[PDB]
Amino acid sequence: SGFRKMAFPSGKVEGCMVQVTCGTTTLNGLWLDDVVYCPRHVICTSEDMLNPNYEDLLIRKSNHNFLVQAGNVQLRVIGHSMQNCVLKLKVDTANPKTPKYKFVRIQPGQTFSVLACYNGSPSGVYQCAMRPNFTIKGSFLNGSCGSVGFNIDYDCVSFCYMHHMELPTGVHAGTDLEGNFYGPFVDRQTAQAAGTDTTITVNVLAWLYAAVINGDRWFLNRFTTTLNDFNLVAMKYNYEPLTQDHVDILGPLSAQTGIAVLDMCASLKELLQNGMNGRTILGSALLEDEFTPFDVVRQCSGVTF
Amino acid sequence: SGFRKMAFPSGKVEGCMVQVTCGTTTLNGLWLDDVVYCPRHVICTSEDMLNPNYEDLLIRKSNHNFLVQAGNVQLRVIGHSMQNCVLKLKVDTANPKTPKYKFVRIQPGQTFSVLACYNGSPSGVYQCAMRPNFTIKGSFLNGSCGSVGFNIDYDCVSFCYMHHMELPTGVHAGTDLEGNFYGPFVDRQTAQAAGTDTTITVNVLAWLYAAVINGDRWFLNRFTTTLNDFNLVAMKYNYEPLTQDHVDILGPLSAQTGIAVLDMCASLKELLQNGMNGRTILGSALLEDEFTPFDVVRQCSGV
Ligand SMILES: *C(=N)[C@H](C[C@@H]1CCNC1=O)NC(=O)[C@H](CC(C)C)NC(=O)CNc1c(F)cc(F)cc1F
């Protein structure tokens, strides 16, 4: 029993983290096969970062301008290119700790683990969700750029996030490992506002299922609603619409608990309309939206990697 | 900026997890140098989990009765002994992934990472606090026993918890790596229950400093309090007494924010009186107590 915000075991990813220096800017890189991936803004300076010409800055840069440190071993750079907002540094040596991996772009509402790194050193690991407004609510300080987000299936690491910046609201923005931004953000030193956020409805429902699996039942409501009736009330409260697709994905959790999705929707409608009346669910006084249906099945059935 | 319940990176511990089988019972073991550590209840027969005599069950076992599997490979057991509630299996091979390590016993309120394991493989990593009633609020199923809790300082892994049991209220009890239980718990399935739990006050105060460091001051007020008046009020909400030791420990956070510890104490008294009034603090509608002053310094200033 119990339900915790669990990250993936981080050991396959720890073995890929390296330090990258260009000029006096130091951040993290991901060393996979014979390539180091890091944010292109490592080639920027104070003078450039307000409106950089990355094309022209990379043109001017040559291999020897990039110090790549893997612990204490300095890696020989033999090649530099840019893909979208990621710098690819070719190095003389394939990472012998390179895990089975792939680059996967996730959707809003999906979850992943962040390995927060400083000077190529893994500091810590935490689970978060890609917000519907494409921000993540991270914890990131100076020197954290190039820190990555991942999922595991079996022995395969799916890399989904590389950290680039903080928005004025204290939330965070980055790219997939192909250098494509999540959300409407650019890599320069300017205040950029995220779109107003919404709650990931399907995840709140998944977490209510987790609560029922762990004997937390007080909020259950026998008065079924319709998808339409639910979505009218969801919209008012800045919740994402629940789709028939979302209903399907809750299929397994619905079968295992015996609670109809539309019955869990009626419960959620009442919590929205009337609050918790001082009570908690799984130690929270807020409705939690950072657990996917699969995250709940994974934790509750003890899936290993 | 931002603040998250961060675990330590788990790689140094993943390299130590093995599977231990005795009869039809399989759980996790911790392989450090040439010793595997696991819960002694791995030798418990399904017939008698109420009053096992572990010294009697163990004297009846040969080395070859313990099957230790490190992923693909069977390790040969050449020795076995019991320390308190932990079994020590000597194996013929030193673990080549053994990190630098030590065994520490932690105090209530101290935090650690759990690597939840089944059959010697990891399911996930999460951050825990040792509760004042000596339980942890974990996530543990059948087969999780031998999962460990740890802190990492530089390159050195401090092991502080090994998982043994779930209590009837869904909270968890276990030992240090010398096999001494935290709290009054025993490795028998006779009725046991944790004392009523209290809030770790010094941790709630650390978290309020974290909320200020991250640019929120809504919950502050113009008041101060004596330590004694704080304690008389806090104890009415089942908060742990704050001590002078706790006040000295919050000194660094006080100095960073320019808020006196007894001024943050006044803020907490008002939060306990009023609640949140529909607001949140660092993404919570409850006062969080699973972050230490050290946790807040490491996460807010430079890990
Ligand atoms: C990578 N090392 C940093 C990570 C930042 C620093 C503190 N926390 C983080 O997550 N990335 C940056 O500093 C980028 C670099 C540019 C070239 C994209 N810049 C930002 O993070 C932007 N910061 C920022 C503003 F520019 C303006 C604001 F109003 C608020 C901000 F957070």
Ligand SMILES: *C(=N)[C@H](C[C@@H]1CCNC1=O)NC(=O)[C@H](CC(C)C)NC(=O)CNc1c(F)cc(F)cc1F
């Ligand atoms: C180790 N693999 C398990 C972990 C448990 C199982 C469910 N969640 C967990 O954390 N440990 C056990 O099964 C122990 C073994 C005994 C011999 C210590 N038993 C329990 O955790 C549950 N049994 C039990 C009590 F521990 C206390 C009681 F008062 C009543 C019980 F039934």
